[PDB]
Amino acid sequence: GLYPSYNTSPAAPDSTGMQSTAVQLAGKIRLGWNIGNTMEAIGGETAWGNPMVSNELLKLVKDSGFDAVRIPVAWDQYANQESAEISAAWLNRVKQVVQMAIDNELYVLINIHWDGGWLENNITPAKKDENNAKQKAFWEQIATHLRDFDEHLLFAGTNEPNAENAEQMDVLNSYLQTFVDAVRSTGGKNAYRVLVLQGPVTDIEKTNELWTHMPADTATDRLMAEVHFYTPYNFALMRQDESWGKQFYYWGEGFLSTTDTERNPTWGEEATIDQLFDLMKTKFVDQGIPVVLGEFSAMRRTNLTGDALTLHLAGRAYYHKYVTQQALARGLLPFYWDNGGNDNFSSGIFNRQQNTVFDQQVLDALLEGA
Ligand SMILES: *CC(=O)N[C@@H]1O[C@H](CO)[C@@H](O[C@@H]2O[C@H](CO[C@H]3OC[C@@H](O)[C@H](O)[C@H]3O)[C@@H](O[C@@H]3O[C@H](CO[C@H]4OC[C@@H](O)[C@H](O)[C@H]4O)[C@@H](O[C@@H]4O[C@H](CO)[C@@H](O)[C@H](O)[C@H]4O)[C@H](O)[C@H]3O)[C@H](O)[C@H]2O)[C@H](O)[C@H]1O
Ligand SMILES: [Cl-]
């Protein structure tokens, strides 16, 4: 009894609008966009440069060709730390954003993101019990408040849990079972809702190596797995050279440099992507289990000038088309990581301030890849 029970209005199981299995639900989704740096921002929905999610944004997203949004959400900072009660106002706000995305005929995946680290950086036997308790209390509140949405709303229990060995993986399995049991306990449409479970560090290789099983579920065929993809780091996100490796400015057959050769990839090209996706195809998809590719993007390097710029941008685009297409070919649901930035080292494909397209190049790539 570290915190009180938040499962206070359990409802009869309700199969209405909840007719699809994870596999069927997955058939409906081919392209996803993260509302990145927004509802998960530390300090508030607008503390990381993005405006509050508006219907206009969600209408643009649907209209641009996305079927789904992944909505990272911060929770801990809105919560009474003694009782783990989440502000009702935050809860209403997350509900309201869910309602609007569902008004726009988008599928929606809400998580508890990094959220300041309380779970994500503490996949550890010392923290296991208090974190299991907090997981339970928060998921009880989130699931109850969102209980009435149809199958357009999926839940994801964690973001990127830092488990790098089998001991930490056993703690993660517990954190995931707690999530599943929380949500199911609230009843209603939550008795059948599709839930998404995260691999260790959402890393394909560590998931293949460490993952053992899915949490136990009272529902039949309502679970998906999730990985992320930022491979190779040197291209997608590296902003400075280190002793151990240099930033890649270019990527893809066709788009490599002959002037500035050390800025080409030494790894993480087309074959590696295909290989990593095949691990996820054989461990999960062939076994009956869709895989959410919850985040991928290669950041823009607008600090390049002239011919270097022009070439980086061509490979960047292709990287995104290639990832999308190769994931879809193997039953991974690709969700683009959009942090809303339109500046250097950012990933925003929309201009959130004007509800317009900022990077038509990357959007067409994603679409043609879809
Ligand atoms: C493995 C995996 O899948 N990881 C995922 O990685 C992606 C890619 O990194 C993550 O998204 C990134 O999140 C960080 C926040 O990071 C926290 O949560 C993720 C944790 O893993 C990490 O340990 C945590 O620190 C985002 O960084 C934050 O960005 C905001 C906004 O401003 C920046 O980004 C937009 C650009 O346009 C802009 O140029 C750049 O500054 C920062 O907020 C600003 O901070 C300044 C500094 O004081 C302040 O002036 C200003 O008013 C604020 O707006 C914040 O400082 C910074 O932490 C990153 O953008 C995002 O891509 C994903 O969450 C993982 O799941
Ligand atoms: Cl349908």
Numbering used by the authors: 96 to 465
Task: Give the published text.
The highly up-regulated CJA_3010 encodes a signal peptidase II lipoprotein signal peptide (predicted by LipoP 1.0), followed by a serine-rich linker and a GH5_4 catalytic module, and was thus predicted to be anchored extracellularly in the outer membrane by N-terminal cysteine lipidation. Indeed CjGH5D, CjGH5E, and CjGH5F all displayed high specific activity toward XyG. The limit-digest products further revealed that all C. japonicus GH5_4 enzymes specifically catalyze hydrolysis at the anomeric position of the unbranched glucose residues of the (galacto)XyG polysaccharide chain. The overall structure of CjGH5D (residues Gly96 to Gln468) is an (β/α)8 barrel as is typical for GH5 family members.
A time- and concentration-dependent inactivation of the enzyme CjGH5D was observed upon incubation with XXXG-NHCOCH2Br, which followed pseudo-first-order kinetics. The dissociation constant Ki and the irreversible inactivation constant ki for XXXG-NHCOCH2Br towards CjGH5D were 1.78 ± 0.17 mM and 0.17 ± 0.01 min−1, respectively, resulting in a ki/Ki value (9.3 × 10−2 mM−1 min−1) that was comparable to that previously observed for a Prevotella bryantii GH5_4 member (PbGH5A). The carboxyl oxygen of the N-acetyl moiety forms a hydrogen bond with His323. There are hydrogen bonds between this subsite − 1 sugar and the catalytic nucleophile Glu390, and also to His208 and Asn254. However, Glu390 is too distant (6–7 Å) from the reactive carbon of the N-bromoacetyl moiety, and has impossible geometry and steric hindrance, to permit nucleophilic interception. The reactive group, however, is located in the + 1 subsite—some 3.8 Å from C1—thus can be fortuitously attacked by the acid/base which is in almost ideal position for SN2 attack on the reactive carbon to displace the bromide.
